[PDB]
Write a protein that binds this ligand. Sequence first.
Ligand SMILES: O=C(O)[C@@H](CNC(=O)[C@@H]1C[C@@H]2CC[C@H]1C21CC1)Oc1ccccc1
Length: 357
Amino acid sequence: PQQINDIVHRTITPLIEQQKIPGMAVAVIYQGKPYYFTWGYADIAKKQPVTQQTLFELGSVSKTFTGVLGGDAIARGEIKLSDPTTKYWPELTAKQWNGITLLHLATYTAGGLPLQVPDEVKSSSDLLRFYQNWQPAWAPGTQRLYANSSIGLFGALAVKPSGLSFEQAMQTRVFQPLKLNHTWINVPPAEEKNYAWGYREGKAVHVSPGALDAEAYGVKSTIEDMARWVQSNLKPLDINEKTLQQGIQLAQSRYWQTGDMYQGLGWEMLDWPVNPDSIINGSDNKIALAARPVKAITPPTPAVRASWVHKTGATGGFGSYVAFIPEKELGIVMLANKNYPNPARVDAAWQILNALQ
Ligand SMILES: O=C(O)[C@@H](CNC(=O)[C@@H]1C[C@@H]2CC[C@H]1C21CC1)Oc1ccccc1
């Protein structure tokens, strides 16, 4: 519909110009159907255009897959958010871990686990040593500090009862049921032709390996698969696998509140209608990566349909954004191979979705 076309082109054209974005793909999900848009270059040097089959690094949008996979493990009865972390990692004997649950890890509330795992932390024994030596700044369940080392550990522990690797669990329990057949934690050689380069300060870059990278920022996907991901989270009851349907719902439950935002598993939520300044200004890393006190939602509120549900994501060379409103059957995916500022992403998305609702 030309409505959607005009709204998308009027918003995204100046965005690409202002932010000097080499390549971009957008999907609008409207009344149960996807509409796709593409611009510019997946590979500047080889003049490869962005297409609907181009793979982008999702970066920290990957945490929404980790949260849903954890939700599925809960639904299967393999894990409980109320479980002690030591239940699944008994070698974690240092006393500061008493009272830190899987809920705390999944929601960044364990007491100040760091944003990044240190570069020097490679092996399973390096990781154990790192968490054993870590000293919390706050008591558990009092402060939120967005952190790869928190939900990354949640994801690694959540798959342990299944006996599967994190990648294998993700493939079998999330990607394959939802027909995300071009979504990868490790891009296979046969798919490299579609893997866009990211651009950082003009240099072509791909994400480098890191501990817990798959769990915190490691998924790559196409605009078509990401539209399917949005539709799956918009309407979980259409999903025929029972524990996956349940796990999607659990990831949109409201566990903590800070300001006007609610923390789910990976996803973040606000009541719809939102104040746009709240979500735009709130997506700035100055707010999004800051330590903030949280109020427990006791017990957590089940997924609220009248919500703005969203997640920003980045790697060194890529910037992504996903947002949807279940009440309105409406969503958007924006995938770019430049890590450009979060408020510009959310501003564009709110202009498009507000116009269409
Ligand atoms: O290793 C990487 O290339 C990735 C992996 N992405 C993350 O870790 C996330 C992205 C940034 C950093 C923490 C999370 C974030 C606040 C949104 O991102 C980087 C690293 C260096 C510079 C910019 C991005």
